Ligand binder design. Structure first.
Ligand code: MG
Ligand code: MG
Ligand code: MG
Ligand code: MG
Ligand code: MG
Ligand code: MG
Ligand code: MG
Ligand code: MG
Ligand code: MG
Ligand code: MG
Ligand code: MG
Ligand code: MG
Ligand code: MG
Ligand code: MG
Ligand code: MG
Ligand code: MG
Ligand code: MG
Ligand code: MG
Ligand code: MG
Ligand code: MG
Ligand code: MG
Ligand code: MG
Ligand code: MG
Ligand code: ZN
Lengths: 86, 129, 60, 104, 232, 155
RNA sequence: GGUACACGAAAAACCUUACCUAGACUUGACAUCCUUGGCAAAAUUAUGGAAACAUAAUGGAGGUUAACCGAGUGACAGGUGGUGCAUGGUUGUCGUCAGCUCGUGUCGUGAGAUGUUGGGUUAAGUCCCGCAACGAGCGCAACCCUUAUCGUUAGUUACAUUGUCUAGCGAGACUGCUAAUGCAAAUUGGAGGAAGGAAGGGAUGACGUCAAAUCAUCAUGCCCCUUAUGUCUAGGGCUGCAAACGUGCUACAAUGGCCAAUACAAACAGUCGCCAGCUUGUAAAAGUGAGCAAAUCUGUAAAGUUGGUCUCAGUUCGGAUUGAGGGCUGCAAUUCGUCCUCAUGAAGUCGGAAUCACUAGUAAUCGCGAAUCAGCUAUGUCGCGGUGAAUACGUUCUCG
RNA sequence: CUGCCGAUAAGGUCUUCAAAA
């Protein structure tokens, strides 16, 4: 879908923290509000706290989850059972 | 001594040129063979409907210029155009042509779409319950 | 919450796609005529007073 | 004698019709009072725009009225003008409504 | 049932437009359109003791012309042309210093048979605690004596401070609303009362216009003289 | 509640066999507002009729349609329960019209192939009083004959 | 309920947005009045930042404060917060149905009656007669627009197969003439006429009913909040899902599917746009790039005609769903944009009880354009043209 | 030309006024 010339997309605020956080050995969960950032190869090995709307759900990225958007691996709404009307 | 007629139907003009000749009428529409300008779906007789019952042996050379409309509308324009040219050669013909009502503008055009309606006269489905 | 949105619309946003068009007389956001910058229910009042030259009732 | 302007193509347009005819009468009278061969005040097709507006404030989309705004248009091309016409052209005073498209 | 606006039904056929201008683009068509409404509203809301009947606006690429008709122009003029300077500064701030203004007060004739000042007088009377029945009747009788045709006054609202809203009408003569050739002048006003809002609607019949034309001719300003100035 | 009788539009003489009735059946088989398509379909069936029956197509069409034409018409009239029917003599204009409608309706349901052959078979099958349109005409005639008693009372 | 359900909304990714979670603000994002100065707000580059916002920078048009930029400052600003059963305004409905009343007079102890009901004629309380009624107002009709023929003016950017076409004015149709019967309105037929008896369509909608709809277009009485029900920003939500209904689209097919060639429109729109041609690409599209501020240039007309093929199959029908690769808009397409290409090929073979619309260019159907719009499964809405029917015997039943 | 055909929660607005012009 997304054009070629444009490429991928990160907010570059997430990119800067990831570069800083990968150099630092004692990595901790990275609190990012950017559900819009696509997972870049360098992201591999870090863990993020994506804002589902209410809380920050923790996602551990792998060498496989690479390519999709960072908010795609977290939910936003919840539905598990209806209730008999009558 | 040529004759000229101007018919119209569904926003379609017509310029019919009546030329006296004695070497077959050679019907012609917009510089093209009638069998090719029209789907030749037997629509050709219609335009000649007032030129048949009186005569076509007088071999009137027809020079038709029609610009607008579809193809039945163009055909309607030239019949009136043929009849309007016919009203300059032997005013008696008029009488018999008037009879069959072949000397009247059809006055029938597509109506305007109305708001709240799915067309000229259609209307949405009504649900009571 | 009307007055604050009106003022914000006049102010330029930080993104081009963030700019929307709101009626200039009232503050209605939806159903705004870009040809006149006037919403559908202010255009009726203005048209019925003669303020817009040439907008006459239609017979088609 | 001179010209200084060949093929002066005056174009007229206005929201109103009667004013447009009046301006053409005034323009023609002055330009024929001087020595100019007017081609003729021809009419052009009027561009009509129509806007549909719902009458009701809240509900009943079905009841919607309509408005129109006609852009009546005329054309007028002057062959040779010269100062004798141009200087007299300064005192014409065209009623606001009529709009000019002088193309030189 | 609901009726089409009487003024709006006769626009472009027998009635001219209150604002006559052609803008450059769709962006400049909106600025030039809200601004004239402010000017008209200014004249009407404040400066009311003058009986301003109608204010017309005329604009070109950059030159603004205002034609203001009033029944008592002394209040606009002021003491040795004082209030006049004030209003000029008002008008200049709304449109802009970069343009040229040519405001023109023009005194009006036959002030009575105009639905605007009658509605304003009606609204003032209701706000002044004047009994409604007496107020309309005095206005009705004075208008008829002025020498016009039938007048229709509808005064709907929280009548006399009541808790249930009513409406009182008083037609007196032929008011042909369905006819296009008739000269019906219409105006509506909001009387702001301590118990709410009162809506007054005045329909006036000022004869039949038997001369075809989109007006371009005055309307009930001709009988007495009509001049004064402040123009250039 | 109307008190006015509707006008009638012209029927037009056919453009080939000069038998008005051809134009009517053309309009009957019309679907999707295609005048062109309908003429082609119908005209092709007469050519198939030539290839098969070796006779004049107009004569065969009249012999089929004239044979299908009914005589009695049963109008529903309910009073208390169900409807007691009433046989009435149908006008000549409606006689041809009803015949054409049935011809088309049973033609677009036959097990045959392209509607050209479908419609061609129905007309040739109706010239010998043995088909689907015949059975419909037979059924209404027998129903009217059975309900002969109430013919006197109409309304 | 009819008079809600492709409705407000003529465009919910952000914005819109009024909702939730969070991070921030308090005469406030916006305004006036007052003591008081103006020697700025912007925009943008840095750092911290989810962004609000902070700390530093070029210190900014101008015109000496005009507007605004401020300080001080309390009255206050602000509310899409409640009440459409307090309202103004606007609208739906009976209904474009033919009604609703008043003045004077008369009758009646009185509510009230009369006119407005009788007989003819209409779409009409339209008109004529009769008549204790005589008149009048609103509605009805006509005056307004548009389509149908012609005359006149004008001839480019139309035409240029020479009088189309476009838009100004005017003529024309007036039951005007005749036949029948009626007191008279008036009905029917005929003549001539492009048009005949409201020639087709539109705008035009009486008093009032339903305490009908809207405080969320706007305005407003009253009540309520006032470091919060006000304000800014980021993310989510308005797009959910065991289900039911309404309105539409696509189909279940040879009156058709696919391929090739090809003829004929009207209206509207266009300089952050319409985009011709050319080059690349299986294609959406990209690059180059003229032309057009427009009767000039651009926005491919499709059904339709001919030829080839399928040969009645759950198929060369039907396109859903799903996977992958691409293009465009936009900071941004996962929640939640659409287009193209490839891959797959749900249901569905005419649909139960019961229901809806329509009386000619109408129903049915085929395309085209515009509005809001950066983009949008708008198949919606408002318009334009191409083809183009069937039926109306009658008021017994049915609804109003 | 006589089939069949039953029901519909409670309390409620609305006339303020002619003194008169
Ligand atoms: Mg508001
Ligand atoms: Mg309802
Ligand atoms: Mg939002
Ligand atoms: Mg300075
Ligand atoms: Mg100073
Ligand atoms: Mg409030
Ligand atoms: Mg209400
Ligand atoms: Mg009587
Ligand atoms: Mg009477
Ligand atoms: Mg009328
Ligand atoms: Mg209510
Ligand atoms: Mg959001
Ligand atoms: Mg929705
Ligand atoms: Mg639809
Ligand atoms: Mg085929
Ligand atoms: Mg050209
Ligand atoms: Mg199956
Ligand atoms: Mg398919
Ligand atoms: Mg997506
Ligand atoms: Mg089958
Ligand atoms: Mg009908
Ligand atoms: Mg269809
Ligand atoms: Mg029963
Ligand atoms: Zn508005």
């Amino acid at each position: 879908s997304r054009s070629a010339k444009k490429g991928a997309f990160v907010d570059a605020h997430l990119l800067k923290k990831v570069i800083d956080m990968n150099k630092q050995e004692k990595k901790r969960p990275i609190k990012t509000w950017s559900r819009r950032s696509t997972i870049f190869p360098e992201f591999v090995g870090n863990t993020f706290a994506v804002h589902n709307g209410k809380t920050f759900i923790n996602v551990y990225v792998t060498d496989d989850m690479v390519g999709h958007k960072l908010g795609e691996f977290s939910p936003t709404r919840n539905f598990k059972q209806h209730t008999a009307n009558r | 001594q040529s004759y000229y007629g101007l018919g119209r139907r569904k926003s379609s003009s017509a310029k019919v040129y009546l030329t006296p000749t004695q070497d077959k009428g050679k019907i012609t529409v917009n510089r093209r063979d009638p069998s090719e300008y029209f789907p030749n779906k037997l629509v050709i007789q219609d335009m000649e409907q007032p030129l048949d019952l009186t005569d076509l042996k007088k071999n009137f050379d027809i020079n038709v210029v029609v610009k607008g409309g579809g193809f039945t509308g163009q055909a309607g324009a030239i019949r009136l155009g043929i009849v309007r040219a016919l009203l300059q050669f032997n005013p008696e013909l008029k009488k018999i042509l008037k009879s069959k009502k072949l000397t009247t503008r059809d006055k029938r055009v597509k109506e305007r779409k109305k708001f709240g309606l799915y067309g000229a006269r259609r209307a949405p489905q009504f649900t009571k319950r | 919450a009307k007055k604050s949105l009106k003022v914000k619309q006049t102010r330029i946003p930080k993104f081009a796609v963030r700019a929307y068009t709101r009626c200039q007389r009232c503050g209605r956001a939806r159903a705004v005529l870009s040809h006149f910058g006037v919403c559908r229910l202010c255009f009726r009042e203005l048209a019925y007073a003669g303020a817009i030259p040439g907008v006459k009732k239609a017979s088609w | 004698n001179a010209v200084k302007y060949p093929e002066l193509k005056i174009k007229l347009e206005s929201y109103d019709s009667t004013l447009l005819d009046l301006t053409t009468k005034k323009i023609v009278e002055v330009v024929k009072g001087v020595d100019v061969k007017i081609k003729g005040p021809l009419p052009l097709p009027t561009k009509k725009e129509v806007i549909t507006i719902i009458r009701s404030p809240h509900v009943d989309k079905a009841s919607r009225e309509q408005f129109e705004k006609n852009r009546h248009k005329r054309l007028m091309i002057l062959v040779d003008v010269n100062q004798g016409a141009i200087d007299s052209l300064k005192r014409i005073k065209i009623p606001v409504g009529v709009t000019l498209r002088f193309s030189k | 049932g609901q009726k089409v606006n009487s003024n709006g039904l006769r626009f472009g056929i027998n009635k001219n437009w209150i604002s006559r201008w052609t803008a450059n683009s769709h962006a400049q068509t909106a600025k030039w359109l809200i601004e004239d409404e402010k000017i008209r509203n200014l004249f009407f809301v404040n400066y009311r003791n003058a009986q301003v009947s109608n204010v017309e606006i005329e604009r070109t690429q950059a030159t603004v012309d205002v034609f203001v008709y009033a029944a008592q122009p002394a209040f606009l003029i002021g003491s040795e042309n004082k209030n006049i300077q004030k209003i000029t500064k008002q008008i200049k701030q709304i449109i802009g210093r970069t343009t040229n203004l040519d405001l023109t007060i023009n005194e009006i004739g036959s002030p009575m048979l105009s639905a605007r000042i009658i509605a304003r007088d009606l609204a003032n009377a209701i706000e002044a605690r004047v009994p409604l029945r007496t107020a309309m009747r005095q206005s009705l009788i004075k208008v008829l004596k002025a020498g016009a045709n039938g007048i229709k006054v509808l005064v709907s609202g929280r009548l006399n401070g009541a808790e249930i809203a009513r409406d009182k009408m008083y037609i007196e003569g032929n008011m042909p609303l369905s006819t296009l050739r008739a000269d019906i002048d219409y105006a509506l006003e909001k009387a702001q009362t301590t118990y709410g809002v009162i809506g007054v609607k005045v329909w006036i019949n000022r004869g039949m216009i038997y001369t075809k034309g989109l007006n371009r001719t005055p309307a009930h300003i001709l009988h007495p003289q009509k001049k004064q100035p402040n123009r250039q | 509640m109307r008190k006015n009788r509707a006008p009638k539009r012209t029927v037009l003489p056919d453009p080939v066999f000069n038998n008005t009735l051809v134009t009517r059946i053309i309009n009957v088989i019309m679907e999707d507002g295609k005048k062109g398509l309908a003429q082609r379909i119908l005209y092709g069936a007469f050519d198939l009729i030539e290839q098969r029956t070796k006779e004049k197509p107009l004569t065969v069409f009249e012999r089929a349609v004239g044979n299908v034409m009914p005589r009695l018409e049963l109008r529903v009239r309910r009073i208390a329960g169900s409807n007691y029917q009433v046989p009435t003599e149908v006008p000549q204009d409606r006689k041809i019209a009803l015949a054409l409608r049935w011809i088309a309706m049973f033609a677009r349901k036959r097990h045959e192939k392209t509607m050209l052959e479908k419609i061609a078979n129905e007309i040739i099958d109706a010239s010998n009083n043995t088909g689907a349109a015949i059975k419909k005409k037979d059924d209404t005639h027998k129903m009217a004959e059975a309900n002969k008693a109430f013919a006197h009372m109409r309304w």
